[PDB]
Amino acid sequence: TRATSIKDVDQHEATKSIAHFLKKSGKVKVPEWSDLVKLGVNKELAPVDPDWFYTRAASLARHLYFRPAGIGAFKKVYGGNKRRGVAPNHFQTSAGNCLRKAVQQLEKIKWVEKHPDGKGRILSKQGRKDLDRIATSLRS
Amino acid sequence: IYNGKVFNQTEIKPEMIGFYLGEFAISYKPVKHGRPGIGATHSSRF
Amino acid sequence: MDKLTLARVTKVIGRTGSQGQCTQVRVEFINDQNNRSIIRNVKGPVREGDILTLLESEREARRLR
Amino acid sequence: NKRAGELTEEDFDKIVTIMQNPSQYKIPNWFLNRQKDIKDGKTGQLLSTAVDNKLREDLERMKKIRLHRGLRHYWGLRVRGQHTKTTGRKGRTVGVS
Amino acid sequence: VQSVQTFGRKKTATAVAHCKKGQGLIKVNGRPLEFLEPQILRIKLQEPLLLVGKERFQDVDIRIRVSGGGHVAQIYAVRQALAKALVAYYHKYVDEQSKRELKNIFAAYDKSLLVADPRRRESKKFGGPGARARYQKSYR
Amino acid sequence: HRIRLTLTSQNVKPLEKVCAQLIDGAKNEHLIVKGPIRMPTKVLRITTRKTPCGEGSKTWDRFQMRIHKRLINLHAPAEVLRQITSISIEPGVDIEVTRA
Amino acid sequence: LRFIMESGAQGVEVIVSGKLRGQRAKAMKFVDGLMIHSGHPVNDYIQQAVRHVQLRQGVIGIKVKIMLPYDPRGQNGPRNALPDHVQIVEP
Amino acid sequence: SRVRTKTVKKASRVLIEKYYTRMTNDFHNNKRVCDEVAIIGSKPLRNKIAGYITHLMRRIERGP
Amino acid sequence: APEVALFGKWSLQSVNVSDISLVDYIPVKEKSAKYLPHSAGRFQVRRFRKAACPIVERLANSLMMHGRNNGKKLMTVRIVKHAFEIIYLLTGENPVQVLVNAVINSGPREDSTRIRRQAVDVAPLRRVNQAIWLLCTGAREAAFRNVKTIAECLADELINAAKGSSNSYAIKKKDELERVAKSNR
Amino acid sequence: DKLNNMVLFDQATYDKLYKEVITYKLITPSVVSERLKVRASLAKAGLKELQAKGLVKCVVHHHGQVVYTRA
RNA sequence: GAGUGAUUUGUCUGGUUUAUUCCGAUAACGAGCGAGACUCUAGCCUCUAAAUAGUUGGCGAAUCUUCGGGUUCGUUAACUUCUUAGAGGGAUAAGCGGUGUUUAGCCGCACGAGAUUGAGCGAUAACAGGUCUGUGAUGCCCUUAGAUGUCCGGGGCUGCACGCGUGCUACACUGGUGGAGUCAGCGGGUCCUAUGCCGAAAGGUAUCGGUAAACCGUUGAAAUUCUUCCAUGUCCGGGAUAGGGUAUUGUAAUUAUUGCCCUUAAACGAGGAAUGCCUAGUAAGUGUGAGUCAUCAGCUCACGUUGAUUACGUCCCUGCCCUUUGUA
Q: Which residues of A5-27 are buried (b: 16+ CB within 10 A; e: fewer)?
A: ebbbbebeebbebbbebbbeeee
Q: Is E30 on the interface with A (CB under 8 A)?
A: yes
Interchain CB contact of I82 with E (< 8 Å): no
C46 touches chain I (CB under 8 A): yes
Contacting residues of I for J31, CB less than 8 Å apart: 148, 152
Angstrom distance, D79 CA to K256 C1': 7
Cα–Cα distance, D2 to D52 (Å, whole number) = 30
Mutate to test the interface with E, among A7, A15, A65 (most CBs of E within 10 A): A7
CA→C1' distance for G46 and K124 (Å): 19
Residue I14 half-sphere exposure, CB side, CA atoms within 13 Å? 12
CA distance I6 to H51: 48
Q: How far is the CA of H26 from the C1' of K90 (A)?
A: 17
Which has the closest alpha carbon to F61: F50, F74, F73, F69?
A: F50
**Angle in degrees, CA B15, B21, B25, rounded to 5:** 100
Chains A and D form CB pairs within 8 A to the count of 3
What are the DSSP calls for A59-126, one per residue? HHHHHHHH--B-HHHHHHHH-EEE--TTSPPEEE-B-SHHHHHHHHHHHHTTSEEE-TTSSSEEE-HH
Resolution rounded to one decimal, in angstroms: 2.6
Q: How far apart are the first and last CA of chain C?
A: 31
I124-143 and I95-106 helices, crossing angle to 10°: 110
Residues 50-69 of F with CB under 8 A from E: 57-60
Our measurement of the distance from residue D47's CA atom to the centroid of its chain's CA atoms, rounded to an integer in Å, reads: 10
CA atoms within 13 A on the CB side of I144: 10
**Chain K footprint positions (protein CB, under 7 Å):** 16-19, 21-23, 32-39, 41-44, 48-52, 55-57, 62-66, 68-73, 81-87, 89-95, 102-106, 108, 113-126, 128-131, 134, 137-140, 153-156, 158-170, 172-175, 177-188, 193-203, 213-214, 217-218, 220-234, 238-246, 253-257, 259-264, 270, 275-288, 297-316
**DSSP E strand stretches across chain C:** 5-16, 22-29, 37-43, 51-54
Distance CA A55, CA A19 (A): 5
How far CA A117 is from CA of A113, E121, J52, in Å, comes to 11, 41, 53
Helix (H) or strand (E) holding F60: strand F60-75
Which residues of chain J approach chain I closer than 8 Å at the C-beta?
25-26, 28, 30-31, 33-34, 40, 59-60, 62, 64-65, 67, 69
Q: Output the furthest CA–CA distance in chain E (Å, rounded).
A: 75
Q: Are A132 and A6 in contact (CB under 8 A)?
A: yes
Element (H, E) at G3: helix G2-6
Contacts of A117 (CB under 8 A, 6+ apart): none
> Cα–Cα distance between J5 and J42 in angstroms, integer?
10
Element (H, E) at E45: helix E43-52
The partner residues of F70 in beta bridges, in order of sequence, read F7, F38
Among E55, E109, E111, the strongest candidate for a mutation testing the I interface, having the largest count of I CBs within 10 A, is E109
Supply the DSSP string of E91-120, one letter for each residue.
HHHS-HHHHHHHHHHHHHH-GGGTS-----
Chain J positions in Cβ-Cβ contact with residue I152 (cut-off 8 Å): 28, 30-31, 65
CB pairs under 8 A between D and J: 5
- Chains I and J contact (Cβ–Cβ under 8 Å for 3 or more pairs): yes
User: How big, in percent rounded to 5, are the helix, strand and coil portions of chain A?
Assistant: 50, 10, 40
B14 touches chain D (CB under 8 A): no
Task: Give first-to-last CA distance, chain D, whole Å.
Answer: 63
Q: How far apart are CA G50 and CA F65, in angstroms?
A: 24
Is the bond preceding E38 in cis, omega lying within 30 degrees of 0?
A: yes
Alpha helices in chain I (DSSP H): 20-23, 55-63, 73-90, 95-106, 124-143, 150-163, 169-184
In chain J, which residues have their Cβ closer than 8 Å to the Cβ of D6? 8
Closest to A17 (Cα-Cα) out of A59, A50, A74: A59
Closest CA to A64 of A10, A22, A103: A103
Backbone phi and psi for residue C12, each to the nearest 5 degrees, phi listed first:
-110, 115
Which technique?
cryo-EM
CA–CA distance, E41 with E74 (Å, rounded to integer): 11
- Evaluate whether A52 touches A110 at the Cβ level (below 8 Å): no
The CA–C1' separation of A73 and K303, in angstroms, is 23
